[model samples]
Target: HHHHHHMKSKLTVVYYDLESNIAEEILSGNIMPDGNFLIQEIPLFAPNLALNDIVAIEREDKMLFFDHLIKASGNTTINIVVLDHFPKDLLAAIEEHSGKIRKNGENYLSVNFPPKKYNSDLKGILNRYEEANILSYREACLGF
Candidate 1:
């Protein structure tokens, strides 16, 4: 028999959104041998969390819950809300700048990019959309 190790799991991160009251966000992660969770997905509502971050977690009812951040991955997380139509060009531009985008719905997008790329080019593209009132975005987590 072979023992399976390093199984991937989904960790839950719960936070209170002032506007929406309470929120529960799910993040896909790998449970490390040392008991740390390596976040693989960009968070949409969870604050101060980003992709590839190592985090401490707690178990409640056999469910893994994110407790706190252990180490940042030096990647930036940007959440975008499309105010008008879906901007394909903007997404293409972001992709051109090497941004990894995860879409939730027709209007919501969660994007991640390396620190260097975000500082160098990604910000400008996002800014243009914001300036035009085409979309609004927030830097959920910034890595330096």
Candidate 2:
């Protein structure tokens, strides 16, 4: 189990989202032996990428840039923007259902959940928060 220290490394993935007015988003991951990069965490702004997904990359400017996805991990990535303080109950609810969260800052969060775990209950909770104007969310990727 401790072998993770050797298997994990930071990989920079480049992305661009024209609609979001975002360009050159970088994400970190681990390089697998098959020459594919395994995303280790949820992406903040990158679309079509989720935790544990395998992807191909190219080198540019002495760094690796995301090229294309090789395989889907069947995980869902949800990006949330907190309108006020972070919602502890939402965090607990997500974790209670075996979801993983990656915080970018005080106001932003990226969450990942296995395909099966992204159930109706979770959707309801997210919707409730959105309706209350407490937080806004986006389903970055919904792997099936």
TM-scores vs. true structure, each candidate: 0.87, 0.85
Q: Tell me how far the alpha carbon of residue 35 in candidate 2 is from the true structure, in angstroms, after superposition.
A: 1.5
Question: Per model, how many backbone clashes are there?
Answer: 0, 0
Q: Considering every candidate listed, which one attains the maximal TM-score? A: 1
lDDT of each: 0.85, 0.82
Q: Model 1: per-residue lDDT, tens digit, 66-106?
A: 99989899988888998756677777877876789888887
Screening candidate 1 with a backbone cut-off below 3 angstroms (N, C-alpha, C), the clashing residue pairs are none
Candidate 1, residue 51: CA error in Å?
1.1
Q: Which residue runs of candidate 2 sit more than 4 Å off their true CA positions?
A: 1-9
- In candidate 1, which residue ranges exceed 4 Å CA deviation? 1-6, 18-20
lDDT of 2 by residue, 40-64 (tens): 8788878888988998988877878
